[PDB]
C-alpha cells in the first residue's frame, strides 16, 4: 500500500537521510582521516578509514530517509566504478549543494532556476579546471606522478613508468603475484575487451569482486545463445578435457542465466559468460578475430556451416588465463598459431591503407592494436603472502591513479583545485534572480572539500580556506605536514579526471534532490 | 463481511483517493515536467518523469480511497492502450470535474442533471475541436509532423514520412533493430491481424510487454481447440523440427490455457495462442487465407477431411517472425508459394468486380490488402546497444504520434486546444438549472491542462491562461521557451485523437464518480 | 456456543440487517436507476446498476443482522429463479412491511393478527391485480409486447413473435449464437424436461450458470444408480468413442456425486448427471420415450434383461447438444430412427382416443408434444463477439419477459399497478383491531415501488404518487421521459406474473420477520 509524500516533505526527509550518510562519510576524508567502526554480524568489528565502505555499509530504516541515502550511494559509487577516488568528495559536495538548495527554496525560490544556475556554475568550473590542468606526457613526469601516487615510493613508480613506456599509455597493464623476491615486468601476448559480468554471482574469488581462472579453450559465436540445450553439449568437453573452457559468444537467453547460476552456485562450474565485444559488422570481425588469435572459429551463422551443438574439441583455442572483472574481460597468452596472427595483422595493416572515414579507421585500428601488441603483466614479488599481497594492492592503486592522471593531467591536491576554480568565475551572467542564487550556492560549496580535509586534521577549516584563498596560485595547505607548501615542490596532486567526475556527479544528484516533487514509497 | 457506505460518504472517500492520484500525476505534466521518485522493493529508486508509471505505481490502502484511484487508473490507462499520450490529461480533467461536481452537489443539486449538462458541454466541445482540427494529408506535412513529434529531428521524420509514403497511411509499419550504422527501410511481405493475448503470462520479452519469436511454421483451424489432447500432438513437431511452430486457430477451451501457462511458465514453451481474426463467413476465408499465404491448410471442419490430431509437418507454412502484442499479432515474411499468392489476389480482385454492399466490399478489400501489400519494417541503426536501443524507442514514439495525428488532424499543443474550444461554446441552451451548472463545471475545467502545464514550468498559471484567452486564435504559450509563440511557426502540436479521447474518458469517469450511490467494499 | 436472543431484540437486529440490504438495493430501481460500485478482491471494481448482483454481494458481519439480510436474499432471489424481474420490488416491499410491522408491534399489538390482516390485504390485492390484468393472446399483441420488452426494438420483437407463432406459446424456444450477420430461426427436432443440476459444480461454462455440451450418445435407466462401480464402465465408452456420452437415469447414490465432483472438478469429465423426468408409471414411459427417440434403451429393470454394467456402445442415441441449466435440461437434435418416432407418436395419438381422466390425458399429451413437436432454436447474428454476445443477452431478456407476460397478461409498468390495486380495496372487513392495522400497513406499503422509482429519477416521490392516485385509471408517470403518459400509448408495461410474485414473496418474508420469536445464532 504505497505511501505518497508531496513536495517539501519528501525533500526534507530525503535530505535528512543524505545528511546522515554524508556526516558519516565526510569524517574519513583527507590524509588525516578518522576511523569508523562498522560492526559486523558474525565476527569482530571492521575498523575502516576509507569513505567507500562506510557508504556501502550505511542503510537507514525510515523509507523516505533511505531514499536520500540510496541516491547518493548509487551516484558516488558509480563514480568509484568509473575510477578510484572521490566517492567521498562527491557525497560531501552533493550534501552541501542539496542542503543549501533546500534552504534557499524554503525562502520562496524556484527549483528549476536554482538548478539552472547551479548547472551554469558547474559547467563554468569544469571549464576552468580543464584550463588549469597540467598534463603529464613525457616518460619522466609519468614516473614522478607514479611515485607521488605510490606515497613517495620509487621502485613502484619506476616499474609503473617503465611498463607505461613499454606498452604505451593507451595500452593494457595488469598486476599479478610474483614467485620471487623483487618485482619485474614481462610483456606477453594477449588482449582485453570491454565486456563484463552478466550476473554478480559468476565471480570466482570473492576477493576484490573478480572472476579469475587458468588455462582454457575458447569458443565464440556471432549469434545469441538462445537455449540451454545449446549449452548441454558445452560443459560436455569441460570436464572431459581437463580445461575449464571459455565461451564468449553473445547474450545468453535468460534461461541459461538462471540455469548457470543453479549449476555453478553451490555446484561450481568453470565456464565463462561474457557478452559480445562491439556492435554489428565490426563485432563479427572481432569475434572471428578472437577466434583466429586463439585457434578456433565463431560458432554462429556463416558460410562454412559450423554450429556449436556438436561437441568438437578439435582446435578451439590456446589461451592462458581469463580474468572477468565487473566491466572488463582479459584473454591472456594466446598462441593459437603463429601464421594466422601475423597474417591477420597484415590484413588489417593493408585495409588501413584505404583512406576511409574517421570511424572505420579507429574501429579497425583497435583490432590492429589488440592483435599486434599485448598486455604487460606486472609480476610483483616480496619477502610472504602478506608482503606481496599488500604490495600488489599498493601498486594497483598507484597504477590506477597514474593512469587516471595521464588522460586529463593533474591539479593541486588536498582539495585546493576547486578552491582555485572559485575566484576565476565570478564573471558569470545570471539571467533570472534564482540563477544567481544557484551560482552563490556553488561558489559556497566549492570550498567544502578543503574545509573538511582541514577540519579532519584538526585546525579550524575557515582560517585555512581563507589563507589559501588569499595565498598565491600554487601554495596549498598540506594536512600531513601542517604548513602551506606547494604543488610542484611538495608533490601532493589529484588527477583532474577525479575532481571533474566528483563535481559532475555531485551536481547531478544534488539537482535531483533539490527538485524531487512527490516521492512514492511502499508502506512497511 | 462486506462494508457498505451510502451516498455522499462513499463519494467523498473515492474523491479523496482520486485527489491523491491526480495530485501525484499532475506534477509530471507538460514539457517542463518534474521528477517523481517511486521507490522499489529490491533495487534503487526509479526516478521517472512521465505520468503513466506514476499512476500504475500508486495504489492506496483505505478501500474506499483505493476505488477512487482504481477507476481513473483503469479508464486513463485504457486511453493509453488506445494511443500513447494524455493519460495525464485524462486523469487531471477527471479529478477537476469530479471535485467540482461533488462540491456543487453538496450545495443541494441533482446528480443526474449535473451529468446531463456536463455531457452536453463535452459533446459540444468535441464538435468544436473537430471543427478546428487541421488535417495532415500531403506527404510533406506528414514529414513536418513526424519531425515535430521526434523533437525537431529530421532523419527520423524523413524516414517516418518515407515509410508512410511507401506503404500508405492505412498500412503497417514496424520498427526493428538495425545491424548497421544508419537507418533504412525495406518493404517485405507479410501482414498483421487484430487479435492479441489470451493470457498476460504468454509474453516472451518482459521488455515493452510483447512476445517476439523467429522462424516458425503455421497451423490454423476454423473450430475452437476443445481439449489439450488436441494439443498433445501439437508441441510434438515443435521440438522435433527445430522451428517453434505457430498455431492460431481459435479460442482454446480453458483447459489448454492453464495447461500452457503450466507448460511455458517456469518451463519455456515456444508456441503461440491467438484468437481468430474476424467473425463468421469472412473469418473462415481469412483463416484459409493465412493458410494459403503461409503454405498449409486450416485444420477445422471442411470437405477435405483434415484434422489436427495427426502430426503432419508436411507443408505447414513459411513465415518469418511472429510478434504478438497485447492486442495485435504480426506474421512476417510469408513465402509459402508464389503461385498461390498471386492466384488468391486475382480471385479477390475478381470478386471485387461484383457490385455488392458496402460491408462485403470493405471486408474483402481488407483481405486484398493484407495479401497484396506488406509491412514496411524500419531498420534503425546506430553507432551500440544504447544508441540503437534508444533511437528505436524515440522513433517508435514519433511513429505512434504521427500515425495518431494523420487520422484526425492536429491542433495547438501545450494544452491550448481546449482553451480554444472554450470561447466558442457559451452558445449552449441548458434546459434545467443544473444543466447550466454542469456547463459551468466543464467551462471551468477546460483550462486545467494549460494551467498545470504552465504551473509545472513555474509561472503562475492564472495569468498565462488569461493572456492566452485574450490573445489571438493561433498564439499559445510555450513552456520550453517561456514566451507565447504559435502553432504553425513554433511547431508545438497535439494530435486531435489524443485530446478528444482524453476529454471523453475524463467526462465518463468523472460522471461515474459524481453519481456513485452506494459503493460496497470488503472488510479488510 | 449458541447465543440466543428473544423477542423484539432479535427482530430489531434482523430488521437492521434487512434495512441495510434494502437501502442498498432500492437505489438501483426503475429506469432512472443508479450505479453501485461493489469492489472486487482481485481486479477492478464492478460498476453495476441492477438489483440482483447488489443483493447477492451484500453479506454483513453481525450474525443477527446477517440473518435479516439472508432471509430476504433467499426469498427474493428464488423469485428471480422463478422469473427474471422484481427481485428489487420484493426486497423493498418486504422491508417496508417488516419495518412498519415492527413499529406497530412496538406500540403493543398482536403479531399474529397483524400477520392475518396483512395476508388478507395481500390476497385481496392479488385478486384485484388479476382482475385488472390485460391478457396477450393474438400473435400481433405478442409482437407488440416483445418489442416493448426489447426496449422499442422491432427486429427482436418480430423474431420473438415469429418463433412464438411457429412453436406455440406453451412450446420451447432457445437462443444460440449465429454464424452470420442477421438473425434467423430454424425449428429442429428435440425436447426438454424439467430436471436440473444435482451439484452446482457440474457446470461447464461459468458464464450464465449453465452447462453446455455437443454431440453425444444417450443412456438412461428406470432405477437409481446405486454405486460408482456401476459408473466405472460408464466413462469407459466416453473417451473411447470421441463422444461425451450422456447418462440421465435417476438419482446417483451419493457416492457417485462426490466421486464425479472429484473426477471432473480439477480433472474435467464430460458426462451428465440429471434426475428422472417425472414420477412412477409415467416416468418409466418417459425414460423409454427418450430412449426410443434417441436410439437406445432404458438400462434399469425390465423384461429384456438389459443392464448398464456391460459397456455396449451399440445403438445408444443420436442427439445434438445437451444444455443443463440449474432447473431444466434440453436434449437437442434427436435423429435415432425415423420409424420409431412416428410409430410412438401414432401410439400416443391412439391411446389419446381412450377417454380417460384429466390427469392421464394431460400427462400423456405432454409426451405427445415432446415427441411430435420440437424446439425453435433462435440463431441471432451480428456484425463480432461483442455485437452478437450482447444482442443474444438482449433477446434472451426480451424472450423471458414476453413469455412471462403471455401467461398472466400485462399491467401498467413503472410500479403503478399496485398503485391501482390500492383504491379498489378499502372494502375489506377487519375482524379484530390488529387486522385493520395489517390492512393499513399493506395500503401504505403498496405505493412504495412507485415512490422509489420516482425518487431515483429525482422528483419528490410523494407528489408523483398523489398525482397518479388522483389521475385517471390509465395515466401513469414515466420516469424515462418525465411526464405522465399512458399504458397503451406510451408502452411501458410489467407482466402480471412478476408483480404478483414479488408481492407474494414480500408478504411471506415480511411476515416471517414480523413474528420471529427467538432466533438462535452461533457465537463467532
Secondary structure (DSSP) of A142-159: HHHHHHHHTTT-SHHHHH
Helix axes A496-514, A113-132, angle to 10 degrees: 180
Residues 6+ apart with CB under 8 A from B194: B277, B327, B328, B329
Do A110 and B61 count as a contact with CB atoms less than 8 A apart? Answer: no
Breaks (C-N over 2.5 A) in chain A follow: 383
What is the rounded distance in angstroms from the CA atom of residue C466 to the CA atom of residue C447? 10
Residues 6+ apart with CB under 8 A from B339: none
Q: Which residue of B has its CA nearest to A280?
A: B179
Per the CB < 8 A criterion, the answer to whether B101 and B111 are in contact is: yes
CB nearest A520 (choices: B57, B179, B180)? B57
Per the CB < 8 A criterion, the answer to whether C405 and C499 are in contact is: no
Q: List the one residue out of C191, A318, C385, A360 whose CA is nearest residue B180.
A: A360
What is the rounded distance in angstroms from the CA atom of residue B490 to the CA atom of residue B412? 10
Work out whether strand A329-332 and strand A190-193 pair parallel, antiparallel, or are unpaired. antiparallel
What is the rounded distance in angstroms from the CA atom of residue B423 to the CA atom of residue C5? 67
Q: List the one residue out of B350, B358, B55, B323 whose CA is nearest residue B177.
A: B323
Q: To which residue does cell 582555485 refer?
A: A420
Specify which residues C521 forms β-bridges with. Answer: C3
CATH class assigned to C190-395: alpha beta
What is the rounded distance in angstroms from the CA atom of residue C94 to the CA atom of residue C76? 9
Give the 3-state secondary structure of A311-366.
CCCCCCECCCCEEECCCCEEEECCCCCHHHHHHHHHHHHHHHCCCCCCCHHHHHHH
**What is the maximal distance between C-alpha atoms in chain C?**
75
Residues 6+ apart with CB under 8 A from C485: C475, C476, C478, C492
Angle at C196 between CA C192 and CA C200, to 5 degrees: 145
Do B36 and A112 count as a contact with CB atoms less than 8 A apart? Answer: no
Q: How many angstroms separate the CA of residue B150 from the nearest CA in chain C?
A: 35
CA distances from B342 to B335, B348, B349, B366 (A): 12, 10, 10, 16
What is the rounded distance in angstroms from the CA atom of residue A395 to the CA atom of residue A398? 5
CA distances from A171 to A142, A336, A347, B440 (A): 14, 22, 22, 73
Work out whether strand B376-380 and strand B173-177 pair parallel, antiparallel, or are unpaired. parallel
Give the cell for residue A420: 582555485
Provide the 10 A C-beta neighbour count for residue A238.
18
What is the rounded distance in angstroms from the CA atom of residue A416 to the CA atom of residue A432? 30
Q: To which residue does cell 457490385 refer?
A: B355
What is the rounded distance in angstroms from the CA atom of residue B415 to the CA atom of residue C78? 55
Helices (H), B383-517: 387-408, 417-424, 434-444, 448-457, 461-469, 496-514
Technique behind the model? cryo-EM
Residues from B in contact with C at Cβ < 8 Å: 1-2, 4, 6, 10, 14, 63, 67, 70-71, 74, 110, 112-113, 255, 279-281, 359, 512, 515-523
What is the rounded distance in angstroms from the CA atom of residue C509 to the CA atom of residue C101? 12
What is the rounded distance in angstroms from the CA atom of residue B404 to the CA atom of residue B409? 8
Do A520 and B383 count as a contact with CB atoms less than 8 A apart? Answer: no
Chains near C with 3+ CB pairs less than 8 A apart are B
Q: How many angstroms separate the CA of residue B216 from the nearest CA in chain A?
A: 15
Cα first-last separation, chain B: 9
DSSP C252: B
Q: How many helices (H) and strands (E) does chain A have?
A: 18, 15
Torsion-angle region of residue C243: left (phi > 0), alpha (psi -120 to 50) or beta? beta
- Chain centroid to Cα B318, Å, comes to 30
Work out whether strand C173-177 and strand C376-380 pair parallel, antiparallel, or are unpaired. parallel
Do B2 and C47 count as a contact with CB atoms less than 8 A apart? Answer: no
Which chain A positions have a beta carbon within 8 Å of B385's beta carbon?
279
- Chain centroid to Cα C179, Å, comes to 29
Q: To which residue does cell 401498467 refer?
A: C412
Per the CB < 8 A criterion, the answer to whether A5 and A518 are in contact is: yes
Helix, strand, or coil (residue A520): strand
What is the rounded distance in angstroms from the CA atom of residue A206 to the CA atom of residue A202? 10
A48 is known to lie in a ligand binding site: no
Residues from B in contact with A at Cβ < 8 Å: 20, 23-24, 27, 32, 34-39, 41, 44-45, 47, 54, 57-61, 179-181, 268, 381-385, 388, 457-458
Q: Which residue of C has its CA nearest to B509?
A: C47
Specify which residues C411 forms β-bridges with. Answer: C494
Residues 6+ apart with CB under 8 A from C373: C167, C168, C171
CB nearest A518 (choices: B36, B181, B385)? B36
Which chain C positions have a beta carbon within 8 Å of B518's beta carbon?
23-24, 27, 36-37
What is the rounded distance in angstroms from the CA atom of residue B450 to the CA atom of residue B89? 10
Which chain B positions have a beta carbon within 8 Å of C59's beta carbon?
1-2
Give the cell for residue A382: 616480496
Do B2 and C179 count as a contact with CB atoms less than 8 A apart? Answer: no
Q: How many angstroms separate the CA of residue C423 from the nearest CA in chain B?
A: 33
Per the CB < 8 A criterion, the answer to whether A333 and A319 are in contact is: yes
DSSP C59: -
How buried is A119 (Cβ within 10 angstroms: 0-12 exposed, 13-18 middle, 19+ buried)? middle
What is the rounded distance in angstroms from the CA atom of residue C209 to the CA atom of residue C228? 27
C86 is known to lie in a ligand binding site: yes
Torsion over CA: B211, B213, B219, B225 (sign) = negative
CB nearest B1 (choices: C32, C60, C268)? C60
What does residue B114 show for φ and ψ, rounded to 5 degrees?
-55, -50
- Chain centroid to Cα C448, Å, comes to 24
Helix, strand, or coil (residue A470): coil
Do C39 and B63 count as a contact with CB atoms less than 8 A apart? Answer: yes
Give the cell for residue B78: 485504457
Which chain A positions have a beta carbon within 8 Å of B37's beta carbon?
10, 14, 67, 71, 516, 518-520
Give the cell for residue A436: 544567481
Q: How many angstroms separate the CA of residue C347 from the nearest CA in chain B?
A: 40
Which value, in Å, is the radius of gyration of the alpha carbons in chain B?
26
Name which of A279, A360, A366, A515 to mutate to probe chain B: the one with the most chain B Cβ atoms within 10 A of its Cβ: A279
Resolution in A: 3.5
Per the CB < 8 A criterion, the answer to whether A251 and A349 are in contact is: no
Give the cell for residue C47: 460498476
Q: How many angstroms separate the CA of residue B514 from the nearest CA in chain C?
A: 10
Which chain A positions have a beta carbon within 8 Å of B23's beta carbon?
6, 518
Which chain A positions have a beta carbon within 8 Å of B32's beta carbon?
112
Residues 6+ apart with CB under 8 A from B287: B220, B221, B222, B249, B276, B277, B298, B300
Which chain C positions have a beta carbon within 8 Å of B512's beta carbon?
35, 47
What is the rounded distance in angstroms from the CA atom of residue B118 to the CA atom of residue B509? 12
Per the CB < 8 A criterion, the answer to whether C196 and C280 are in contact is: no
Helix, strand, or coil (residue A498): helix
A325 is known to lie in a ligand binding site: no
Q: List the one residue out of A510, A512, A519, A514 whose CA is nearest residue A10.
A: A519
Q: Which residue of B has its CA nearest to C381?
A: B280
What does residue A48 show for φ and ψ, rounded to 5 degrees?
-115, 165
Provide the 10 A C-beta neighbour count for residue A179.
8
b/e burial code for range B306-341 (CB count within 10 A of at least 16 → b)? eebeeebeeebbbbbbbbbbeebbbbbbbbbeeeeb
Torsion-angle region of residue B332: left (phi > 0), alpha (psi -120 to 50) or beta? beta
Q: List the one residue out of B495, B452, B419 whose CA is nearest residue B24.
A: B452
**Hey, what long-range contacts does B458-467 have (CB within 8 A, 24 or more apart)?**
B458/A110, B458/A112, B458/A113, B458/B32, B465/B419
Do B523 and C61 count as a contact with CB atoms less than 8 A apart? Answer: yes
Q: How many angstroms separate the CA of residue C112 from the nearest CA in chain B?
A: 34
Per the CB < 8 A criterion, the answer to whether A77 and A87 are in contact is: yes
What is the rounded distance in angstroms from the CA atom of residue A118 to the CA atom of residue A97? 9
CB nearest B255 (choices: C41, C44, C268)? C268
Residues 6+ apart with CB under 8 A from A517: A6, A7, B27, B34, B35, B36
B/C interface, count of CB pairs below 8 Å: 78
What is the rounded distance in angstroms from the CA atom of residue B67 to the CA atom of residue B516? 11
Do A520 and B385 count as a contact with CB atoms less than 8 A apart? Answer: no
Whether there are 3 or more C-beta pairs closer than 8 Å between A and C is: no
Provide the 10 A C-beta neighbour count for residue B1.
10
What is the rounded distance in angstroms from the CA atom of residue C249 to the CA atom of residue C253? 12
Secondary structure (DSSP) of A6-32: -THHHHHHHHHHHHHHHHHHHTT-SSS
Do C54 and B279 count as a contact with CB atoms less than 8 A apart? Answer: no
Torsion-angle region of residue A295: left (phi > 0), alpha (psi -120 to 50) or beta? left
Per the CB < 8 A criterion, the answer to whether C297 and C204 are in contact is: no
Q: To which residue does cell 547518493 refer?
A: A72
Per the CB < 8 A criterion, the answer to whether C296 and C218 are in contact is: yes
The CA-based dihedral angle spanning residues C332, C337, C343, C346, taken in that order and rounded to the nearest 10 degrees: 30
Whether there are 3 or more C-beta pairs closer than 8 Å between A and B is: yes
What is the rounded distance in angstroms from the CA atom of residue B10 to the CA atom of residue B25? 23
- Chain centroid to Cα A116, Å, comes to 28
Give the cell for residue B313: 509437418
Per the CB < 8 A criterion, the answer to whether B65 and B13 are in contact is: yes
Per the CB < 8 A criterion, the answer to whether C323 and C213 are in contact is: yes
C414 is known to lie in a ligand binding site: yes
How buried is C155 (Cβ within 10 angstroms: 0-12 exposed, 13-18 middle, 19+ buried)? middle
What is the rounded distance in angstroms from the CA atom of residue B37 to the CA atom of residue B56? 13
Which chain B positions have a beta carbon within 8 Å of A519's beta carbon?
36-39, 45
Specify which residues B521 forms β-bridges with. Answer: B3
Specify which residues B47 forms β-bridges with. Answer: B37
Q: Which residue of C has its CA nearest to B251?
A: C385
Give the cell for residue A365: 585500428
Do B458 and A63 count as a contact with CB atoms less than 8 A apart? Answer: no
Question: Which stretches of C294-423 are assigned E, i.e. beta strand?
Answer: 322-324, 329-332, 376-380, 410-412
Work out whether strand A246-247 and strand A218-219 pair parallel, antiparallel, or are unpaired. parallel
Give the cell for residue B92: 487531471
How buried is A429 (Cβ within 10 angstroms: 0-12 exposed, 13-18 middle, 19+ buried)? exposed
H-run or E-run covering B130 = helix B113-132
Which chain A positions have a beta carbon within 8 Å of B181's beta carbon?
280, 359
Secondary structure (DSSP) of C452-516: HHHHHHTS-HHHHHHHHHTS-SS--B-TTTSSB--STTT--EEEHHHHHHHHHHHHHHHHHHHS-
What is the rounded distance in angstroms from the CA atom of residue C503 to the CA atom of residue C445? 10
Per the CB < 8 A criterion, the answer to whether B272 and B250 are in contact is: no
Q: How many angstroms separate the CA of residue B319 from the nearest CA in chain C?
A: 28
What is the rounded distance in angstroms from the CA atom of residue C201 to the CA atom of residue C211? 10
What is the rounded distance in angstroms from the CA atom of residue B145 to the CA atom of residue B149? 6
Helix, strand, or coil (residue A444): helix
**What is the maximal distance between C-alpha atoms in chain A?**
75
Which chain B positions have a beta carbon within 8 Å of C24's beta carbon?
4, 6, 518, 520
Residues 6+ apart with CB under 8 A from B343: none
A87 is known to lie in a ligand binding site: yes
Do C58 and B4 count as a contact with CB atoms less than 8 A apart? Answer: yes
Helix, strand, or coil (residue A295): strand
Amino acid at each position: 500500500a504505497k505511501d505518497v509524500k508531496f513536495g517539501a516533505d519528501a525533500r526534507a526527509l530525503m535530505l535528512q537521510g543524505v545528511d546522515l550518510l554524508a556526516d558519516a562519510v565526510a569524517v574519513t576524508m583527507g590524509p588525516k582521516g578518522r576511523t569508523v567502526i562498522i560492526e559486523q554480524s558474525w565476527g569482530s568489528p571492521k575498523v575502516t578509514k576509507d569513505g567507500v565502505t562506510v557508504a556501502k555499509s550505511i542503510d537507514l530504516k525510515d523509507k523516505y530517509k533511505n531514499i536520500g541515502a540510496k541516491l547518493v550511494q548509487d551516484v558516488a559509487n558509480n563514480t568509484n566504478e568509473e575510477a578510484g577516488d572521490g566517492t567521498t568528495t562527491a557525497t560531501v559536495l552533493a550534501r552541501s549543494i542539496a542542503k543549501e538548495g533546500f534552504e534557499k527554496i524554503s525562502k520562496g525560490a524556484n527549483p528549476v532556476e536554482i538548478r539552472r544556475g547551479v548547472m551554469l556554475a558547474v559547467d563554468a568550473v569544469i571549464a576552468e579546471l580543464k584550463k588549469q590542468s597540467k598534463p603529464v606526457t613525457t616518460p619522466e613526469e609519468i614516473a614522478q606522478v607514479a611515485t607521488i601516487s605510490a606515497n613517495g615510493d620509487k621502485e613502484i613508480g619506476n616499474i609503473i613508468s617503465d611498463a607505461m613506456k613499454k606498452v604505451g599509455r593507451k595500452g593494457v597493464i595488469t598486476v599479478k603475484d610474483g614467485k620471487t623476491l623483487n618485482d619485474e615486468l614481462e610483456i606477453i601476448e594477449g588482449m582485453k575487451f570491454d565486456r563484463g559480468y552478466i550476473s554478480p554471482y559468476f565471480i570466482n574469488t570473492s576477493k576484490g569482486q573478480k572472476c579469475e581462472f587458468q588455462d582454457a579453450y575458447v569458443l565464440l559465436s556471432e549469434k545469441k545463445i538462445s537455449s540451454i540445450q545449446s549449452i548441454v553439449p558445452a560443459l560436455e568437453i569441460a570436464n572431459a578435457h581437463r580445461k575449464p573452457l571459455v565461451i564468449i559468444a553473445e547474450d545468453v537467453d535468460g534461461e541459461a542465466l538462471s540455469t548457470l547460476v543453479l549449476n555453478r552456485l553451490k555446484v561450481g562450474l568453470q565456464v565463462v559468460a561474457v557478452k559480445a565485444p562491439g556492435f554489428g559488422d565490426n563485432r563479427k570481425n572481432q569475434l572471428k578475430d578472437m577466434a583466429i588469435a586463439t585457434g578456433g572459429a565463431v560458432f554462429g551463422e556463416e558460410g562454412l556451416t559450423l554450429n556449436l551443438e556438436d561437441v568438437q574439441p578439435h582446435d578451439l583455442g590456446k589461451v592462458g588465463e581469463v580474468i572477468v572483472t565487473k566491466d572488463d574481460a582479459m584473454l591472456l597468452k594466446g598462441k593459437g598459431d603463429k601464421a594466422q596472427i601475423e597474417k591477420r595483422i597484415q590484413e588489417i595493416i593493408e585495409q588501413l591503407d584505404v583512406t576511409t572515414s574517421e570511424y572505420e579507421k579507429e574501429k579497425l585500428n583497435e583490432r590492429l592494436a589488440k592483435l599486434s601488441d599485448g598486455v604487460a603483466v606486472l609480476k610483483v614479488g616480496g619477502t610472504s603472502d602478506v608482503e606481496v599481497n599488500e604490495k600488489k594492492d599498493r601498486v594497483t592503486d598507484a597504477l590506477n591513479a597514474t593512469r587516471a592522471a595521464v588522460e586529463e593531467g593533474i591539479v593541486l591536491g588536498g582539495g585546493c583545485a576547486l578552491l582555485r576554480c572559485i575566484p576565476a568565475l565570478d564573471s558569470l551572467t545570471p539571467a533570472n534572480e534564482d540563477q544567481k542564487i544557484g551560482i552563490e550556492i556553488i561558489k559556497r560549496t566549492l570550498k567544502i572539500p578543503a574545509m573538511t580535509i582541514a577540519k579532519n586534521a584538526g585546525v579550524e577549516g575557515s582560517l585555512i580556506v581563507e589563507k589559501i584563498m588569499q595565498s598565491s596560485s600554487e601554495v596549498g595547505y598540506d594536512a600531513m605536514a601542517g604548513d602551506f607548501v606547494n604543488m610542484v615542490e611538495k608533490g601532493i596532486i589529484d588527477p583532474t579526471k577525479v575532481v571533474r567526475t566528483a563535481l559532475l556527479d555531485a551536481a547531478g544528484v544534488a539537482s535531483l534532490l533539490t527538485t524531487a516533487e512527490v516521492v512514492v514509497t511502499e508502506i512497511p
